[PDB]
Write a protein that binds this ligand. Structure first.
Ligand SMILES: CC(C)c1nc(CN(C)C(=O)N[C@H](C(=O)N[C@@H](Cc2ccccc2)C[C@H](O)[C@H](Cc2ccccc2)NC(=O)OCc2cncs2)C(C)C)cs1
Length: 325
């Protein structure tokens, strides 16, 4: 069982350190259940985001083996291109040998320049991995470095320490009640069916069901822009001068919980979860249109995951949820 501590950066990004190569070169990576590639910046990249983050240097690793396979990824925010290569990755106390990973060669755009983390470690299914690169957790399972084909995620609140990815384990110290298991609707993302979104008894979105993914790499609770717009009004949010959804800090005490029904079980989010507070109070919701085969995706990001300990089970292709302790 491997324990990977995560730093909680402003309740918006959760990243942990990994080592790559021999000797180990260290990187912070987002542990991202919404993607499936591992990549870090490399010395081959001249982009500005590469210049203000750690860069992997193959020349200094005795176990590195190059490939001539290239890689390209577009995320909802930014993007990268690079090279695949093989090396030993240290993650959660586990020596993940012969792990294929991306060495960036371009990292355009503002966001990655200002992000505190170097790269991304995806935890989703191999079917959505760019250039078919074996995801890290698949490589762990295939080498037998975890005994149970599952991992769990605890994300702390209020910028506290203690966030953790548990590789190969479930820890009931981190939740209360029993774990509720949700079948994966479509194996790619950790994609599940959301039955309803309600408020004060009344359905306010996702009437008749909608597809959703559980995504540690997304800060907010996002959905189709239209549906999100109604929710933004139902809680009393509106764009400011400079483009942010302001909610009175007065309403954290007044409004009722918003309830997500998943596989017939109710998962409430209180105003203290879906209203981001700092004097300054913003909406935890944000519009973002994610079109796919199965339909337009909702994103249950860190706003939701902070309230529910989450188990990602590849043995039986299910997601487990329980209220955090
Ligand atoms: C400044 C402060 C307030 C904030 N920082 C943030 C951090 N941001 C921007 C995000 O969380 N933004 C999310 C995001 O892209 N998360 C990303 C991590 C990331 C962050 C920054 C730069 C590069 C990558 C990672 C997320 O798991 C997204 C979720 C997703 C899935 C499918 C389609 C679209 C989106 N995953 C992907 O984009 O997967 C890439 C793929 C494309 N094809 C197959 S997988 C968006 C979905 C909104 C939010 S608020």
């Amino acid at each position: 069982i491997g324990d990977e501590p995560l730093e909680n950066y402003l309740d918006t990004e959760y990243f942990g350190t990994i080592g790559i190569g021999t000797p180990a070169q260290d990187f912070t990576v987002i542990f991202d259940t919404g993607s499936s590639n591992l990549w870090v910046p490399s010395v081959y990249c001249s982009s500005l985001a590469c210049s203000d983050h750690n860069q992997f240097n193959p020349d200094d690793s005795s176990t590195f083996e190059a490939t001539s396979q290239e890689l390209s990824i577009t995320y909802g925010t930014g993007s990268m291109t690079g090279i695949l290569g093989y090396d030993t990755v240290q993650v959660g106390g586990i020596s993940d040998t012969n792990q294929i990973f991306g060495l960036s060669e371009t990292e355009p755009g503002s966001f990655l320049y200002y992000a505190p983390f170097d790269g991304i470690l995806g935890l989703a299914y191999p079917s959505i991995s760019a250039s078919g690169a074996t995801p890290v957790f698949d490589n762990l399972w295939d080498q037998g470095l975890v005994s149970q084909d599952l991992f769990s995620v605890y994300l702390s609140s209020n910028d506290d320490s203690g966030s953790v990815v548990l590789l190969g384990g479930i820890d009931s110290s981190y939740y209360t009640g029993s774990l509720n298991w949700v079948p994966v609707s479509v194996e790619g993302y950790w994609q599940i069916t959301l039955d309803s979104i309600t408020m004060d008894g009344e359905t306010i979105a996702c009437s008749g069901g909608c597809q959703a993914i559980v995504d540690t790499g997304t800060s907010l609770l996002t959905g189709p822009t239209s549906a999100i717009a109604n929710i933004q009004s139902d809680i009393g949010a509106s764009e400011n001068s400079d483009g942010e959804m302001v909610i009175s800090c007065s309403s954290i005490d007044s409004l009722p919980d918003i309830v997500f029904t998943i596989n017939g079980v109710q998962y409430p989010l209180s105003p203290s979860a879906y209203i981001l507070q700092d004097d300054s109070c913003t909406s935890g919701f944000e519009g973002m249109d994610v079109p796919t085969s199965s339909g337009e995706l909702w994103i249950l990001g860190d706003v939701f995951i902070r309230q529910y300990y989450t188990v990602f089970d590849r043995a039986n292709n299910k997601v487990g949820l329980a209220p955090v302790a």
